[PDB]
Design a protein around this ligand. Structure first.
Ligand SMILES: [K+]
Ligand SMILES: [K+]
Length: 344
């Protein structure tokens, strides 16, 4: 079975990507703070991998130049017009205590193809330039968001993405590997390497947790796939493989619905996304593959080998499930076009 694919070098190491609509892709990344002449940017592209030339396949609509001597962005998300970007200021500034407005709010003006900076905030008050914003997610309705820094033990901050105010701070036990919101925004679930923690975004209260996973599993990624159901991807510590598990969440309780080792071909994964329909998952592996997983069967149906040269940093599915995009620190964007209703 053949898939239409296309690739493009965006000109800088890419660390984040998100579809803004069915064919418009936001990419973020950069050369970092050094005097290397490699910019730090947000780029909005219209994608159509069926066109004849790379410039037609990847049509640049807008670019926003971040500071040349800013760090490169590390994480982004977008919902309901709000774009949130995690990006450190210059390291000297951070270390001196001048402030680090590391969570930034942008919008993209569709009518005009213009990106605009709106506001930014220093949430962490960090003076350690080695710490960065590892996770940024916004809920589907766009009224709550969560961020988490790279520092361990991690703090997860639940925030209002309209004005960048903090709702509350969650002091977690150790490293936060990933997090995701329920579609109604009322619940946030996060994972450490060995546990699932489920928290109310309304009260900050604990809803449920699970710590009794197989001792050979290192939890890696989490996404909601139905109202009260999460998909967790884990890697094997000893041996090689990826396990996917579906877990329902109740007040005070969780239940494992279904679990399957979907492959022994990958040691780890760098990124995962699930489509709006909850039918398709996409994985990026440590060895630079993109994999398609049909969730109804938990079956890995296709692997694209060497989709990027190294360091796939994010994979994202368009809202209509037509396109899978991935980006990498090797400066490339890879697009796969999927058949209608593929995940069935
Ligand atoms: K630079
Ligand atoms: K996630």
């Amino acid at each position: 079975m053949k898939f239409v694919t296309a690739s493009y070098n965006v000109g800088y190491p890419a660390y984040g990507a998100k579809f803004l609509n069915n064919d418009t892709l936001l990419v973020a990344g950069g050369g970092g703070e050094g005097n290397n002449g490699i910019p730090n940017k947000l780029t909005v592209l219209r994608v159509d991998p069926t066109k004849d030339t790379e410039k037609e396949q990847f049509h640049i609509l807008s670019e926003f130049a971040l500071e040349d001597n800013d760090d490169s962005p590390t994480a982004i998300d977008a919902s309901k017009g709000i774009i949130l970007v995690g990006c450190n200021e210059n390291s000297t500034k951070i270390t001196q205590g001048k402030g680090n407005k590391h969570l930034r709010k942008f919008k993209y003006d569709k009518v005009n193809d213009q990106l605009e900076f709106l506001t930014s905030v220093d949430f962490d008050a960090s003076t350690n330039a080695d710490d960065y914003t590892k996770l940024v997610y916004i809920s589907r309705e766009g009224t709550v968001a969560a961020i988490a820094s790279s520092k361990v033990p991690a703090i997860m901050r639940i925030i209002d993405p309209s004005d960048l105010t903090e709702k509350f701070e969650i002091e977690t036990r150790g490293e936060v590997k990933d997090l995701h919101f329920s579609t109604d925004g009322k619940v946030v679930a996060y994972i450490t390497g060995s546990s699932l923690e489920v928290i109310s975004t309304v009260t900050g209260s604990c809803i449920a947790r699970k710590t009794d996973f197989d001792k050979n599993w290192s939890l890696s990624k989490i996404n909601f796939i139905a109202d009260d159901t999460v998909l967790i991807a884990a890697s094997l510590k000893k041996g090689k493989g990826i396990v996917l598990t579906k877990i329902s969440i109740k007040s005070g309780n969780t239940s494992v619905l279904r679990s399957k080792q979907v492959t022994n071909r990958f040691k780890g994964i760098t990124s995962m996304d699930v489509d709006m329909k909850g039918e398709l998952a996409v994985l990026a592996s440590n060895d630079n593959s993109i994999a398609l997983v049909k969730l109804k069967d938990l079956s890995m149906s296709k692997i694209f080998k060497q989709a990027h040269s190294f360091a796939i940093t994010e994979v994202t599915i368009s809202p209509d499930s037509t396109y899978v995009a991935s980006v990498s620190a090797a400066n490339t964007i890879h697009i796969i076009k999927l058949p209608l209703n593929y995940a069935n």
